[PDB]
Amino acid sequence: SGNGAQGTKFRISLGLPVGAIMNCADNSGARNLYIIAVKGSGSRLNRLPAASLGDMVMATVKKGKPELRKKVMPAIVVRQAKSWRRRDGVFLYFEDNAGVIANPKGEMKGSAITGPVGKECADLWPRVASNSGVVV
Amino acid sequence: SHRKYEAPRHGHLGFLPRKRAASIRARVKAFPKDDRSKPVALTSFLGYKAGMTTIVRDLDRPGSKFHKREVVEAVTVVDTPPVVVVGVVGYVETPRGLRSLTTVWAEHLSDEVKRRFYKNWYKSKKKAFTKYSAKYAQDGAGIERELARIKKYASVVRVLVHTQIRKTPLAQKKAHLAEIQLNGGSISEKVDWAREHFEKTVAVDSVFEQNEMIDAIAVTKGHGFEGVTHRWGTKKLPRKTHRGLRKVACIGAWHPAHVMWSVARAGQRGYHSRTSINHKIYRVGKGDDEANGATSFDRTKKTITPMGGFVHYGEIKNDFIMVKGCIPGNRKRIVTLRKSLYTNTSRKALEEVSLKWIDTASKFGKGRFQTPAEKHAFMGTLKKDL
Amino acid sequence: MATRTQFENSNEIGVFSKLTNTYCLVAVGGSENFYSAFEAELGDAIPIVHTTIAGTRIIGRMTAGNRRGLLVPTQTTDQELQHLRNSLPDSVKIQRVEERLSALGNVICCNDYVALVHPDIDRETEELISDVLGVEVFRQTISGNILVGSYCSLSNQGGLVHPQTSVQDQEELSSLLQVPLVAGTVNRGSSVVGAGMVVNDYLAVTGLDTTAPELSVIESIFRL
Amino acid sequence: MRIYQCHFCSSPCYPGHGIMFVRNDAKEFRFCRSKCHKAFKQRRNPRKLKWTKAFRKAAGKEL
Amino acid sequence: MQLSWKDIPTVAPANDLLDIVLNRTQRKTPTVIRPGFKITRIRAFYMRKVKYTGEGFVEKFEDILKGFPNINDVHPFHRDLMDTLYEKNHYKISLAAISRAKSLVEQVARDYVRLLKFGQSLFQCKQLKRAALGRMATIVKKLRDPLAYLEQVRQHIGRLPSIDPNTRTLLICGYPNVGKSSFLRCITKSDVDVQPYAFTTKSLYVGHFDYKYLRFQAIDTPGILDRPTEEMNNIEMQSIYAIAHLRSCVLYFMDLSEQCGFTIEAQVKLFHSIKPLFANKSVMVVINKTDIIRPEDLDEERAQLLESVKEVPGVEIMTSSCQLEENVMEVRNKACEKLLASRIENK
RNA sequence: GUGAACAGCCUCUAGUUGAUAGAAUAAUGUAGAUAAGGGAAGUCGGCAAAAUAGAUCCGUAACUUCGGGAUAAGGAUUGGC
RNA sequence: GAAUGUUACCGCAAUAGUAAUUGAACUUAGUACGAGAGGAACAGUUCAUUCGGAUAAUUGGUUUUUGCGGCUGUCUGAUCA
């Protein structure tokens, strides 16, 4: 929420709450990245604050890299695969979830990220647009 | 004590009083400041909401995501019949009650304002203002003398007008009497303004200009004696729970023994009146105004008549007014417009207009062709019709 | 010349904007801030008219071009080439070119005679691109990476190469790509190279995050 | 200046509404309505079932 | 370029710590009546007690240790700066008094859970609270003493610089009260405004320059360094000394302009005291104002570091003047280039 | 009649239309409906609900006293002409 | 709702009670200050989260106008209905 993003992009009401098993499809050899904590707000009764396309949360590693488990690492969603919320009218989506590798510091690590990447996260985070390939 | 720590409020209210709408007319208690520099201009107006549409406009606003892109929102085009001045009544101030006696009406009254006073139209002998119309037969000792008092012993003037229903598709067959305050130079140019404007329509070459910040007041839609569950926001108890599964949450008040004010339950979610401000006028249309759908991309002669119809309306036969944004409260009833109160912040009036593509397809079904002649041309002559 | 600012807190100016040697095409971002930068430098036949594409602010991922010839994806609309074409003489083609993807910056580089496209798709509309530019495009991967526009961006003089590159790769492509191939760190040891800076025929706008020995490459290899 | 025409449904209507399903790698058919979205998820074939205009090309309409 | 200081926030000694007093106050205060029944109004003050507990508990005893490294980290020079302030005395008294109040929290928690016992008689509770208050008092007393010292040196570290020995560093030092107003100040922009400085007559005027892409900068401590350690029973002179001990390239400063007949004959046999200590340290001699040198002390002073006579390895000397702006760039450049062809060239 | 069968459902014969009705469908109830993303965030608690579910064929671990586990899980096959 | 001749339309609003909050980014500004390692506020433009009061032209959810189309068991001989 302020670690190198181009302004405050429109926080789209997606569907990624706490306990969402996120997959993995990039330069890393991991299979899935389970998230144990999803937020992105403040004063709000009852609700589990979800994460929109381009938010920085902390995820864990289950299957793929057993050497790197039980730790905290950044995980920016690069694949929305859900209907967003704009002003044009268009609402296209993908299929599979996101899942990128990042060093436990505050930046990124992955570069050769395969699969379709949303243009919304690319515009917000320069690191995503610089490390992608196929956009929409 | 508390649950966790007080928690927020889903039973949070918003309207102390409220109640059902015992009148189609809203409660207008706000009036703009009278100015002497600007000429005689209205402060309020009347009309009827038609519906919404999709208009493509180039976002001149420096958006932090879009800007200069083809985006759309939600606008409304409030319809307004030719309002004719048939009453000139002036006042002074507002102490603890009304304070005047100079009430000047008219003579040529149609069959619109003669139905407002009487529920049974058939029992009416069509003999209204008989003692008032007899004052015009003489020199006018009780007419011209009244105007001599307004030019000195008065201040504000609330012009009594109505709305034409003979050309209005709204099935009501009755005009709507309202009060419109006008602000201009001195206090003698107010009464004489509406006096010389009898049997006349609404002129758009004097007061009504291009891009003016106006307001909007309509009537809210109700839903009966709706309870705390849907009216405010009560939870849902599991199926395991008995004697109820969506009942009101246990209050447990004490705060004075007379149970608190915001423990509200069932009343009337809606059916009141709202108040919207800060709205820019896009385009002022008329009754016989053609080529309403001025598309700056396809360049085709078309109107904005809804090819389906919303609810209780028609096919556009009066002067339509397209304004920026929408308006709270459902239509099918009198909508009291209002001009700018004072120097508002706005923070959006810096941007002009850039309307191009105008939607005029179906409103009942899905959006397809804009013009019905296009579908007929694409189909061609077959079995039925041409 | 070689200036350095913090435009919208983004050292990667190559991602947002793209000032190639073909035509000075500037995106939406650049009011009076960017105008004060290249005031006495530019203002010639190549202005700084703002524009957009497909409802995005990224203009570095759409095309390349040498000195004359710019294409346009079929994903976006034609509401930009109906007024901007007046300023430019004859470079941007108005022919409806079918696009297979969307981003054409990290897969294809821009220069004059040297070009490279990462092997991933077939040969359909790609041949049409090489026909206009007149460049014998030879497909070749680099260190098993799909990115190439953010790892290297050569010109008519030299070319900065990504530090994480094998020695063998920095020799076999020295005669064909006619570049000395100088490997070294860039932008405080960043992972991007050509995405943080855009080499032009005249000036060379970079970033302030670029260290002194990382910036001295331009004033040594490229030579002014 | 081009005329917007639907692909999978073959019906020239509104450009947006626009909830569409991409093919990950390659591109997809731009939907012209929301009804076309649910007609692709169930793997419906527009070639056999009459819903497009391409099938009418092999039919022939000369009255 | 830092170490492990200027990160610790403010610390309330004893006068600014009056919080304990306030708390004990409200405590002995209580006096509740307990709702419900008037015969069962004896059950509540237990909660009262747990409360006070947690309170002092969190208190302090952990924020003091933060901001301070170790008594045996890496280089002794990092703790040498504290020797001229609190001295290994208050030093250990650093981590010393540290662990002091530290365990103090121990006894704290101790007696804490201790009384903890019972949740009847709010009154007895008042007495317990009073006892706790007294205990707290008997501590921060002697506490705030050295703790006062604490706050002091605390703020203290805001003017004192902190270089990094894990990189290239060019030691630059000069002798004030001569003419550094238009000589040494031609390199940096240091000037006394608000921040004062004792010891010497002047303050801290550290020079700095950024040539090519290197980084050469080091402060100077005049006074203690210009005299043997034995002569200074402490102070900072020794400060000057450790200061030295640090370095990569020591640059000695001379002046053969004769301001008032202040030639050097006694300090000649002093450079040999730090000569074998310079295993990998480059030397450089810079003489200011070289034009009015009269042949009266020239045929004697030259047998020091100028010519190959005594205690000289055989380096290059420079005789010019930066006051008249005569090749000031050449002098600054030819004083750190030797380090590039030494430690940098080898490592 | 269908079906593995004697269940259920439908149809024929015999046996029937007494259990207040009408108008109206705002909120709060018993049993019974259906909701993208997320797939155990609610609860003391696998407590409610839903999905998986038959026959034929194939496949079917560890343990045990070889009468068992065993109709395992994970798949495929299925109607009418 | 009973109402002092009555009904309808059009005004003034006492008393009581009271209702929006917070953060970030861009420009000014890689700024004022400073020895190095570092690093702000005011004005103007452009947003998001949460709560309350609303709206249904588009999207999503719901389907008693038990529609239209298709299908299983049984029946009016059979077919259409």
Q: Where exactly are the structural domains of chain D?
A: 2-63
- By the 8 A CB rule, do C186 and C214 touch? yes
Q: Where exactly are the structural domains of chain A?
A: 15-136
Work out whether strand E284-288 and strand E318-319 pair parallel, antiparallel, or are unpaired.
parallel
Helices (H), chain E: 19-28, 45-58, 77-83, 87-92, 95-115, 122-156, 237-246, 298-301, 328-333, 337-340, 343-346
Residues B288 and B345 occupy one common structural domain = yes
- By the 8 A CB rule, do B77 and B89 touch? no
- By the 8 A CB rule, do E334 and E249 touch? no
Q: Is position B352 within any domain? A: yes
Helices (H), chain A: 119-124, 126-130
Structure tokens at B195: 């006096």
Task: Look up residue C142 and give its DSSP letter.
Answer: B
Residues B165 and B313 occupy one common structural domain = no
Distance between CA atoms of residues E7 and E66, nearest Å = 8
Distance between CA atoms of residues B198 and B281, nearest Å = 26
Q: Is E282 exposed, middle or buried (0-12, 13-18, 19+ CB in 10 A)?
A: buried
- By the 8 A CB rule, do C31 and C49 touch? no
The string of DSSP letters for E207-245 reads -EE--TT--EE----TTTTTS-TTT-SSTTHHHHHHHHH
Q: Is position B299 within any domain? A: yes
Distance between CA atoms of residues B30 and B35, nearest Å = 16
The fold of the A15-136 domain, in CATH, is Ribosomal Protein L14 (2.40.150)
Query: In this structure, what are the phi and psi dihedrals at residue B14, rounded to the nearest 5 degrees?
Result: -175, -20
Distance between CA atoms of residues E246 and E261, nearest Å = 33
Query: In this structure, what are the phi and psi dihedrals at residue C160, rounded to the nearest 5 degrees?
Result: -80, 130
DSSP SS3 for B37: coil
- By the 8 A CB rule, do E171 and E248 touch? yes
Residues B117 and B73 occupy one common structural domain = no
Give the technique used to solve this structure: cryo-EM
Distance between CA atoms of residues A68 and C195, nearest Å = 30
Residues in chain A: 136
Q: Is B288 exposed, middle or buried (0-12, 13-18, 19+ CB in 10 A)?
A: exposed
Distance between CA atoms of residues E242 and E229, nearest Å = 10
Neighbours of B206 (CB within 10 A): 10
Q: Is position B314 within any domain? A: yes
Torsion of CA C77, C78, C83, C87, to 10 degrees: 100
E189 touches strand G (CB under 7 A): yes
What lies within 8 Å, CB to CB, of E74 at 6+ separation is: none
Instruction: Give the CB-side neighbour count of residue C211, counting CA atoms within 13 A.
Output: 13
Distance between CA atoms of residues E14 and E148, nearest Å = 8
Q: Residue A40 to residues A15, A19, A54, A57, A104: CA-CA distances in angstroms?
A: 13, 15, 11, 8, 19
Cα–Cα nearest to D5, from D62, D52, D63: D52
Structure tokens at A17: 């709450």
Neighbours of C168 (CB within 10 A): 8
What angle separates helix E45-58 from helix E122-156, to the nearest 10 degrees? 10
- By the 8 A CB rule, do E163 and E169 touch? yes
Task: Mark residue E155 as left, alpha or beta (left: phi above 0; alpha: psi -120 to 50; beta: remaining).
Answer: alpha
Resolution in A: 9.5
Are B and D neighbours with ≥3 CB pairs closer than 8 A? yes
Distance between CA atoms of residues B258 and C202, nearest Å = 82
Write out which nucleotides of chain G lie closer than 7 A to a protein Cβ. 8-13, 16-19, 22-30, 34-37, 44-60
- By the 8 A CB rule, do A67 and A91 touch? no
Structure tokens at B273: 């009146």
Residues B76 and B35 occupy one common structural domain = yes
Q: Which domain holds residue B59?
A: 16-81+203-220+270-384
DSSP SS3 for E299: helix
Residues in chain E: 347
Residues B123 and B64 occupy one common structural domain = no
What lies within 8 Å, CB to CB, of C124 at 6+ separation is: C98, C100
Helix (H) or strand (E) segment spanning residue C132: helix C126-133
B96 touches strand G (CB under 7 A): yes
Q: Hey, what amino acid is at E241?
A: Y
The single residue listed with the structure tokens 């933060």 is E66
Q: Is A32 exposed, middle or buried (0-12, 13-18, 19+ CB in 10 A)?
A: middle
Distance between CA atoms of residues B82 and E322, nearest Å = 92
Neighbours of A86 (CB within 10 A): 19
CA of B330 to C1' of F33 (A): 31
Query: In this structure, what are the phi and psi dihedrals at residue B320, rounded to the nearest 5 degrees?
Result: -90, 145
Are A and E neighbours with ≥3 CB pairs closer than 8 A? no
Distance between CA atoms of residues B215 and B275, nearest Å = 8
Q: Which B residues 319-378 touch D at CB under 8 Å?
A: 361, 366-369
B57 touches strand G (CB under 7 A): no
DSSP SS3 for B108: coil
DSSP SS3 for E284: strand
Determine whether the interchain pair A9/B64 forms a contact, defined as Cβ–Cβ distance below 8 Å: yes
Contacts of C107 in chain A (CB under 8 A): 133
Q: Which A residues 6-65 touch B at CB under 8 Å?
A: 7-10, 43, 45
Query: Which residues of E belong to the annotated binding site for GTP?
Result: 174-181, 220-224, 288-291
Q: Residue B377 to residues B73, B170, B372, B380: CA-CA distances in angstroms?
A: 31, 33, 9, 5
Here the contacts of B56-59 (C-beta below 8 Å, separation 24 or greater) are: B56/B355, B56/B356, B56/B357, B57/B353, B57/B354, B57/B355, B57/B356, B58/B354, B58/B356
Residues B207 and B327 occupy one common structural domain = yes
Q: Hey, what amino acid is at B211?
A: N
Of D14, D15, D20, the CB nearest to A92: D20
The number of angstroms, rounded, from the C-alpha of B117 to the middle of its chain's C-alpha atoms is 22
Q: Is position B329 within any domain? A: yes
Chain B CB within 8 Å of residue A86 CB: yes
Residues B155 and B50 occupy one common structural domain = no
- By the 8 A CB rule, do B110 and B84 touch? no
Contacts of C77 in chain B (CB under 8 A): 70
Residues B216 and B342 occupy one common structural domain = yes
Q: Hey, what amino acid is at B300?
A: T
Distance between CA atoms of residues C95 and C92, nearest Å = 9
The single residue listed with the structure tokens 């006062």 is E148
Torsion of CA E132, E133, E135, E141, to 10 degrees: 160
B15 touches strand G (CB under 7 A): yes
B232 touches strand G (CB under 7 A): yes
Instruction: Give the CB-side neighbour count of residue A73, counting CA atoms within 13 A.
Output: 19
Task: Look up residue A59 and give its DSSP letter.
Answer: E
- By the 8 A CB rule, do C18 and C25 touch? yes
Residues B179 and B86 occupy one common structural domain = yes
Greatest pairwise CA separation for chain B in angstroms: 85
Residues in chain D: 63
The single residue listed with the structure tokens 């040999």 is E272
Which residues have CB under 7 A from strand F?
A: A 14-21, 48, 50, 82-83, 97; B 223-230, 237-247, 266
DSSP SS3 for E271: helix
Neighbours of E81 (CB within 10 A): 20
* Rounded to 5°, angle at Cα E147 from E143 and E148: 120
Cα–Cα nearest to C26, from C59, C3, C53, C56: C59
Distance between CA atoms of residues B235 and B246, nearest Å = 6
Distance between CA atoms of residues B44 and B29, nearest Å = 12
Structure tokens at B203: 């002129």
Residues B66 and B25 occupy one common structural domain = yes
Distance between CA atoms of residues B261 and B16, nearest Å = 8
Write out which nucleotides of chain F lie closer than 7 A to a protein Cβ. 26-32, 36-42, 47-49
Helices (H), chain B: 130-133, 144-150, 191-195, 228, 372-379
What lies within 8 Å, CB to CB, of B278 at 6+ separation is: B213, B215, B325, B344, B346, B348
What lies within 8 Å, CB to CB, of B89 at 6+ separation is: B100, B102, B103, B104, B157, B158, B159, B160
What lies within 8 Å, CB to CB, of E341 at 6+ separation is: none
- By the 8 A CB rule, do C209 and C168 touch? no
Q: Hey, what amino acid is at B54?
A: T
Task: Look up residue E172 and give its DSSP letter.
Answer: E
Residues B213 and B301 occupy one common structural domain = yes
Instruction: Walk me through the domains of chain C, giving residue ranges and CATH numbers.
Output: 1-224 (3.75.10.10)
DSSP SS3 for A65: coil
The string of DSSP letters for B170-237 reads STT-----EEEEEE-STTTTTHHHHHT-TT----TTTT--SS-EEEEE-B----SS--HIIIII----
Radius of gyration of chain B (CA): 26
- By the 8 A CB rule, do B369 and B375 touch? yes
Question: Where residue B46 sits, what CATH number does that domain have?
Answer: 2.40.30.10
Q: Is position B190 within any domain? A: yes
| Beta bridge pairs of residue E253 | E286
Q: How many folded domains does chain B comprise?
A: 2
- By the 8 A CB rule, do B78 and B335 touch? yes
Cα–Cα nearest to E14, from E141, E152, E146: E141
Instruction: Give the CB-side neighbour count of residue B368, counting CA atoms within 13 A.
Output: 17
Task: Mark residue C105 as left, alpha or beta (left: phi above 0; alpha: psi -120 to 50; beta: remaining).
Answer: alpha
Distance between CA atoms of residues B37 and E54, nearest Å = 70
Residues B140 and B285 occupy one common structural domain = no
Cα–Cα nearest to B374, from B360, B358, B356: B360
DSSP SS3 for B243: coil
Radius of gyration of chain C (CA): 17
Helix (H) or strand (E) segment spanning residue B357: strand B355-358
- In which order are the strands placed within the sheet that holds A56-59? A21-23, A32-37, A56-59, A73-76
Determine whether the interchain pair A135/C101 forms a contact, defined as Cβ–Cβ distance below 8 Å: yes
Here the contacts of E304-309 (C-beta below 8 Å, separation 24 or greater) are: E304/E264, E304/E268, E304/E271, E305/E252, E305/E271
Cα–Cα nearest to A97, from A112, A113, A83, A77: A77
- By the 8 A CB rule, do A101 and A26 touch? yes
- By the 8 A CB rule, do B225 and B267 touch? yes
Determine whether the interchain pair C28/B67 forms a contact, defined as Cβ–Cβ distance below 8 Å: yes
Q: For residues B225-258, b (16+ Cβ closer than 10 Å) or e, as one string? A: ebbbbebbebeeeeeeeeeeeeebeeeeeeeeee
| Beta bridge pairs of residue B53 | B75
Q: Is C84 exposed, middle or buried (0-12, 13-18, 19+ CB in 10 A)?
A: middle
Q: Residue B223 to residues B220, B273, E38: CA-CA distances in angstroms?
A: 10, 14, 52
- What 3 state SS string does E37-81 have? CCCCCCCCHHHHHHHHHHHHHHCCCCCCCCCCCCCCCCCCHHHHH
Cα–Cα nearest to C174, from C152, C197, C150, C149: C152
The number of angstroms, rounded, from the C-alpha of C84 to the middle of its chain's C-alpha atoms is 20
Work out whether strand B75-80 and strand E171-172 pair parallel, antiparallel, or are unpaired.
unpaired
- By the 8 A CB rule, do B268 and B226 touch? yes
Nearest CA in chain C to B62: C28
Q: Hey, what amino acid is at C57?
A: R
- By the 8 A CB rule, do E109 and E57 touch? yes
- By the 8 A CB rule, do C102 and C110 touch? no
